[PDB]
């Protein structure tokens, strides 16, 4: 429902926003009357400094491993709990398939581009109806 902010100059109002963005001053200004359109400009490079949608999608997950000061009993109970919830999603085949495909590509000394193209192809096929089997070896080859 709308939610689209469009910057316009109320003094000029003669054309769609043909503006200039001053990053050093942190403003955006109309290149005609010289009137600023917005102050306090946000950055995208600065938030990126601390840090894959193409393959993993929007799914999120976090690992549980052992801690600095912890017991080995709690590490097993948390991993066994995830082992019971691993059936909630059918994405175990993508990680194992990409693992074995990773082993074969690393065994064939092929570049990473062919690895990403092959993983993308297997992601395009995945589990469709026209495949109807092939025992996971033929779709990988």
């Amino acid at each position: 429902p709308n939610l689209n902010i469009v910057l316009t100059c109320p003094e000029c109002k003669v054309y769609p926003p043909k503006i200039v963005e001053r990053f050093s001053e942190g403003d955006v200004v109309c290149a005609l009357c010289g009137l600023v359109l917005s102050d306090k400009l946000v950055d995208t490079r600065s938030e990126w400094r601390t840090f894959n949608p193409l393959l993993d999608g929007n799914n999120l997950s976090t690992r549980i491993g052992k801690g600095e000061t912890t017991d080995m009993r709690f590490t097993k109970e948390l991993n066994k709990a995830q082992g019971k919830n691993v059936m909630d999603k059918k994405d175990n085949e993508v990680q194992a398939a990409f693992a074995k495909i990773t082993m074969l590509c690393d065994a064939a000394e092929l570049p990473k581009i062919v690895k990403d193209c092959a993983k993308e192809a297997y992601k395009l096929c995945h589990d469709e109806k026209t495949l109807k089997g092939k025992s996971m070896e033929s779709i990988m080859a």
Partner: protein, 147 residues
Amino acid sequence: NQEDSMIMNQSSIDRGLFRSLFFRSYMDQEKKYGMSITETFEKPQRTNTLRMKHGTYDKLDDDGLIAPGVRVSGEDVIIGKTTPISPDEEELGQRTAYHSKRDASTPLRSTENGIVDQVLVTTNQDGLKFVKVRVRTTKIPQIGDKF
């Protein structure tokens, strides 16, 4: 001269005393995420390219690079690189009008200036075409320089 201060002869400075050269290397590389999106070194046009920096693009060639010997200053784009975008991915501001690509060039530093010394293009390990640039600048000894 007080407090470890030094007075230097100006005529000696003009004749080339303690003058040094500074070589800054800007390395850029085009990459491909999932083969569908491919970064390309090219000269961005001001008509169809969105998110273009306010720097001048007259010093770039047809391949998106500056030939050595061209005097460059701050806020000048040395290597022009554009990234493909999707129309239904962002549609921010005028993205539904530029249609084509998004600028992602690597300009020179804001406070720097000099003469481009050497530019070379080569494919790396996985075959990605990267380019290295080297600009030289003579730094005449100033009052604020330390010895």
